[PDB]
Homo-oligomer: A and B are copies of this chain.
Amino acid sequence: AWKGEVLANNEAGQVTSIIYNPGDVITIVAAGWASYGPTQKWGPQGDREHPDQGLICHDAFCGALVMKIGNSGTIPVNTGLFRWVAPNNVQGAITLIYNDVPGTYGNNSGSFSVNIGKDQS
């Protein structure tokens, strides 16, 4: 299992110790407060009112927690994933990333606390 934090200002994301293998079932729980720039802060589902101006993940709100598995496209995580199995052919290290517009991460603040574990399978 992996426990840590995902900084909002980290454009490269956080490479975890979890290697998703075919057949794996995972659970993720995410908490905390972060911002894409404004003085306000949002939780891991991000800001529902904010327009998409070129986000790395178009299926999640700006300020949401998202992930990649190996070299996959981004997959929304939000508050977490419960006993989740990935799409076929998706495998490798899980990287967690804050959802913002490329090149605009420098003014972000805060972080999400995240736990990931493999479940029974």
Contacts and interface: CB of A to CB of B under 8 A. Distances in A.
B29 A81 contact: yes
Nearest to A18: B23
Contacts of A107: none
Contacts of A41: 48
A49 B115 CA distance: 25
A119 B42 CA distance: 29
24 contacts: A19-B21, A19-B22, A19-B23, A21-B21, A27-B27, A27-B29, A27-B82, A29-B80, A30-B79, A31-B45, A31-B80, A33-B45, A43-B44, A43-B45, A43-B79, A79-B79, A80-B80, A82-B117, A117-B121, A118-B118, A118-B120, A118-B121, A119-B119, A120-B120
